[PDB]
Amino acid sequence: GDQRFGDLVFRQLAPNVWQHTSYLDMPGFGAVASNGLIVRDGGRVLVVDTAWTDDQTAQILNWIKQEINLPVALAVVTHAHQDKMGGMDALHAAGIATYANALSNQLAPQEGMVAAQHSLTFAANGWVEPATAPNFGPLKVFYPGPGHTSDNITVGIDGTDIAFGGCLIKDSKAKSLGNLGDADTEHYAASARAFGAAFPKASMIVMSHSAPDSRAAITHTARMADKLR
Ligand SMILES: C[C@H](CSSC[C@@H](C)C(=O)N1CCc2ccccc2[C@@H]1C(=O)O)C(=O)N1CCc2ccccc2[C@H]1C(=O)O
Ligand SMILES: [O-]
Ligand SMILES: [Zn+2]
Ligand SMILES: [Zn+2]
Numbered sequence: 758g759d760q761r762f763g764d765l766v767f768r769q770l771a772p773n774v775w776q777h778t779s780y781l782d783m784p785g786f787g788a789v790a791s792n793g794l795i796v797r798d799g800g801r802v803l804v805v806d807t808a809w810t811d812d813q814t815a816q817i818l819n820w821i822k823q824e825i826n827l828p829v830a831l832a833v834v835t836h837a838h839q840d841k842m843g844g845m846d847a848l849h850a851a852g853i854a855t856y857a858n859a860l861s862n863q864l865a866p867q868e869g870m871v872a873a874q875h876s877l878t879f880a881a882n883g884w885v886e887p888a889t890a891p892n893f894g895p896l897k898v899f900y901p902g903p904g905h906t907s908d909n910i911t912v913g914i915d916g917t918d919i920a921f922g923g924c925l926i927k928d929s930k931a932k933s934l935g936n937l938g939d940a941d942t943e944h945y946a947a948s949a950r951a952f953g954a955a956f957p958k959a960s961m962i963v964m965s966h967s968a969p970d971s972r973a974a975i976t977h978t979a980r981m982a983d984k985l986r
Contacts, residue, residue: 762820765813770961770969771917773797775824777817779808781839791840791965794921795821796914798894801830804853805896805912805921806965807844814844818851829853833877833896835923836909837861837868838939840965845871856890858900860908877910883951899955901925902948903941904982909948913956920959922952922975928967929977934985946982949975 760767766778775795780788793806795817802821807814821829831854834842842865848855849871857865859876866872877889879900890898895915903909905924912921925948927934934940941948953975962974 763816765808765816765820767795767820767824770794770919770963771914774914774917774919776963776969777806777808777820779810779813779817781809789840789966792963792967793841793965794912794914794919794963795825796895797825797827798830800827801894802827803894803896804829804832804848806834806841806923807832807848809840809843811844811847811850814847815851817844818847818853830892831856832873833857833890833893833898833910833912834861834873835911835921836906837864837870838906838924839870841923842868842870842873845873849874858908858910861910864908879910883955897956899952901951901955902944904945904948905937906939907941911952911955913959918958918960919963919969920952920956920961921963922965922978924965925949925952925978926962926964926974927978927981928964928970929973931967931974931977931981934978934981942985946979946986949979949982953979 855873857873862872885898897913
């Protein structure tokens, strides 16, 4: 089940895959959970998303050292907001190579984030340009179009039934999407559907602010995003 490690929660999702969860008390919004992923690829570990803070992200690295005890070869972060990139400095202090969408790196300063060290770029069809994502192992990175933000990216894990939608995807019982100022209202619905089509066989949809869900999370997020266009 859930594994409490200090103020963080870790949950094994598949043999080589764990979800990390961290919390931030946001005035006016309560204590908000954010989820990312940890993947073991042979003798190395790959991280998807930081925690909200540097201190929490250092604790993720501490958990990895205790439960896996292999080097963290790289981290990929899925857009320039605090839940996904708030802990970049902790990754850099630990010597970990970091990757984000070029657009996330461009937006990072004005969003109050530290940029990743390397920039991913994407083909017109959304798949990462392979030269920009060297040694990514099973991580299959896809840009579905603007939605939750202009720069949001998504990640499939080869050899598993898991795809990670980040903050683009909400769960199948979610009530709304909100009126968030960074969202692309014109394109959000198509981007959600493009994520589902990019990972057509993934049956476990992992996301930033809900527990893992079936593919109904995609249909429901899209079906909900329709009523904004
Ligand atoms: C200063 C703080 C940073 S929070 S990360 C960027 C947010 C704008 C955002 O996109 N959120 C926030 C968290 C969240 C919680 C539940 C559903 C959806 C979200 C969404 C996301 O990551 O998908 C900040 O900007 N805010 C604080 C908290 C918060 C909570 C919920 C909605 C908006 C916000 C945001 C604010 O509008 O002040
Ligand atoms: O976010
Ligand atoms: Zn966001
Ligand atoms: Zn989020």
